[PDB]
Design a protein around this ligand. Structure first.
Ligand SMILES: O=C(O)C(=O)c1ccccc1
Ligand SMILES: O=C(O)C(=O)c1ccccc1
Length: 305
């Protein structure tokens, strides 16, 4: 009657995302005895960051906390969730959530369960000051989130998982990196970060996913309980707006300088991120990308303007 599901984190255990995950697992377990439990396996030391998506697809683990940016090896469509401009509660009402799950099911043998990070724009962080929206000469650490935009800004790019960013900065292998507004202190990157470029762009996606067979094997009661707890997790996404503000102030206090462009240049920079981001998605998966685009836009922005 009680099922135990094995869950891995693609992010380091000392980061904010695992700090959010563990109290939720604790609640699931405390309230789920006799019904459903989650066995947290650990972070990248258990399964490498870029392998967690495949581990879920193949059932080596039941569940993961991960970003689609880390499992483009399963399906390139996985990276598209950075382009959401409505929050997950609204995605559940407008068909976006179901559309995501349809693709994840078919192309990845994966059920898309919940989004536990949103309202976290991405930024360029760098040690080489710029005064225009261009990165010529710079070598920047990335995941797939940033590839299209940073290449369009003339950056050289190199892929690393989050746990190798500190080392890349320490060795001076990169001038900078992409990351959300929040979290740069968790793995001590502030030590080697001089600037953050504004504005931010896209919206970070960190979600829970599950092996599709394992999801289908749940009893109705187990699935209903899991769903209740998944919505409980998402209801706490109000945190992210607070965290963004605190982290922005924390960077200023730490002496990280904000690079700002004028109003027109800033507006065009964020527009460019979305234009090239969607153009890349469209090349990668025309039908899925086009469909997601119509479901991911703000209600106020989806028609003629
Ligand atoms: O820069 C990354 O590693 C990345 O892709 C990501 C995605 C979501 C949240 C934080 C980082
Ligand atoms: O709201 C905060 O002060 C904040 O940034 C934070 C960070 C981690 C846990 C709790 C709060």
């Amino acid at each position: 009657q009680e099922v135990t599901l094995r869950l891995v984190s693609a992010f380091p255990e000392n980061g904010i995302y695992v700090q959010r995950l563990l109290p939720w697992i604790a609640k699931v377990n405390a309230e789920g005895k006799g019904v459903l439990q989650i066995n947290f396996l650990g972070g990248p030391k258990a399964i490498p960051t870029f392998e967690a998506g495949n581990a879920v697809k193949t059932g080596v683990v039941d569940m993961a906390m991960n970003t689609g940016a880390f499992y483009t090896n399963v399906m390139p469509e996985a990276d598209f969730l950075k382009l959401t401009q409505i929050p997950v509660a609204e995605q559940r009402k407008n068909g976006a959530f179901d559309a995501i799950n349809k693709v994840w099911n078919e192309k990845g043998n994966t059920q898309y369960l919940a989004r536990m990070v949103e309202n976290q724009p991405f930024h360029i962080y760098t040690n080489k000051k710029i005064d225009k929206p261009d990165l010529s000469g710079q070598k920047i650490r990335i995941s797939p989130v940033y590839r299209d935009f940073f290449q369009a800004l003339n950056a050289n790019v190199v892929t690393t998982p989050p746990g190798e960013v500190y080392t890349a900065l320490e060795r001076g292998v990169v001038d900078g990196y992409g990351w959300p507004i929040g979290g740069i202190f968790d793995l001590n990157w502030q030590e080697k970060t001089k600037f953050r470029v504004d504005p931010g762009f896209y919206d970070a996606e960190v979600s829970l996913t599950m092996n599709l067979p394992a999801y289908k094997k749940l009893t109705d009661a187990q699935r209903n309980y899991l769903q209740k707890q998944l919505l409980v997790l998402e209801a706490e996404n109000t945190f992210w707006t607070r965290y963004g503000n605190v982290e922005t102030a924390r960077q200023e206090t730490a002496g990280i300088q904000t690079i700002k462009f004028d109003a027109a240049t800033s507006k065009a920079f964020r527009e460019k991120a979305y234009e090239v981001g969607w153009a890349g998605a469209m090349k990668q998966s025309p039908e899925v990308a086009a469909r997601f685009k119509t479901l991911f836009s703000k209600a106020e922005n989806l028609y003629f303007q």
